[PDB]
Design a protein around this ligand. Structure first.
Ligand SMILES: [Co+2]
Ligand SMILES: [Co+2]
Lengths: 207, 213
């Protein structure tokens, strides 16, 4: 009875470390990821976890994932918006398709996560939404136009969302890594157990 | 008189956009008026001789391609771009539809990207130029109902920051013009946009912050 937590980009990096940590801590986690091959292996490692291969950009996949969490665990206590991809090229060399891939996955994906998760959290009397910040701090860098745009956008989305859901006992917390994936994973764990009283809205880790 | 530059302005039919158009044109700059409301663009184009009415949607690469090209055919070149297009839908984050969300982000954020993508080549043709982004307070201060608006305004700074680092070696200056922290008239912003454009070349300005006096 630790709480059902949905995690995007769970097949690798921070997502995987987070998945592994929460599962080893008694959390019943849902693993959302695009890479089916990796997810399949992780689904057998974390027995009990709910493997949910899909596309964070698709609103349909989000409906199915949240519905699946409630059907398998009876509820959704938290969402960890981690999913994040990049395409490092000079701003004027990026194509619309590349721009969209990053923005739709990193930013639109988080928005959809929130939209589809809130209704499920409300039915549980509340919950937590954790967003993973940029893995390169909050300073612009060459070739990062799309990436920075998505990560900065994410903060704006999270800031407004925090104010919106605050009275419905839904805490929006940002975990901003900008070392090791196991580190960020620890930060996410803290955000899920420590707060609760809806006060901490941002945890930052040293570069 | 008649060789100050050719500037393409988005959201030119109203507010800051229109104020920038009137000033720059009065100062000798050739201007392209980009906005969706064709009637208002035509009306404003009539008030300014030479002004190029370029109705179009900043979300479409197609309209940007045609706009920039129209600029080069009418004025022989494009010297600068001013991003001022914007739309707003405010409401609780989870109550926002995917459609309402895309309207805001594609127009306010993707629109600037497409603008940089299609204006740069025309600027590289003449050896350089300027891209001015009109910022917003919503770019730093979250607020109830601003999920999509804040996200697009925060993201704009991310895009702009990396953009200036990518283009500075090609002599393309990306400068941001935005409000202070804590009323600012449309004419005041137009003035800042004016300076950003006309200033000597040497470790120039990357950002100009304004506030009501
Ligand atoms: Co993944
Ligand atoms: Co209009």
């Amino acid at each position: 009875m630790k709480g059902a937590v949905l995690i995007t980009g769970a097949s690798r990096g921070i997502g995987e470390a987070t998945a592994r940590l929460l599962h080893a801590k008694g959390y019943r986690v849902g693993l959302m990821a695009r890479d089916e091959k990796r997810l399949q292996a992780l689904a057998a490692e974390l027995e009990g976890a709910l493997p949910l291969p899909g596309d964070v950009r698709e609103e349909g996949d989000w409906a199915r994932a949240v519905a699946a969490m409630e059907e398998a665990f009876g509820e959704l206590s938290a969402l960890v918006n981690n999913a994040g991809v990049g395409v490092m090229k000079p701003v004027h060399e990026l194509t619309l398709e590349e721009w969209r891939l990053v923005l739709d996955t990193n930013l639109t994906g988080a928005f959809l996560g929130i939209r589809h998760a809130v209704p499920a959290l409300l039915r549980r009397g509340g919950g937590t939404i954790v967003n993973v910040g940029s893995l390169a701090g909050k300073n612009p860098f060459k070739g990062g136009a799309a990436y920075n745009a998505s990560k900065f956008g994410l903060l704006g989305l999270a800031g407004a969302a925090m104010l919106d859901l605050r009275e419905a006992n839904v805490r929006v917390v940002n975990v901003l890594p900008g070392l090791k994936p196991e580190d960020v994973a620890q930060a996410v764990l803290f955000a899920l157990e420590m707060p609760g009283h809806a006060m901490v809205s941002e945890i930052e880790l040293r570069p």
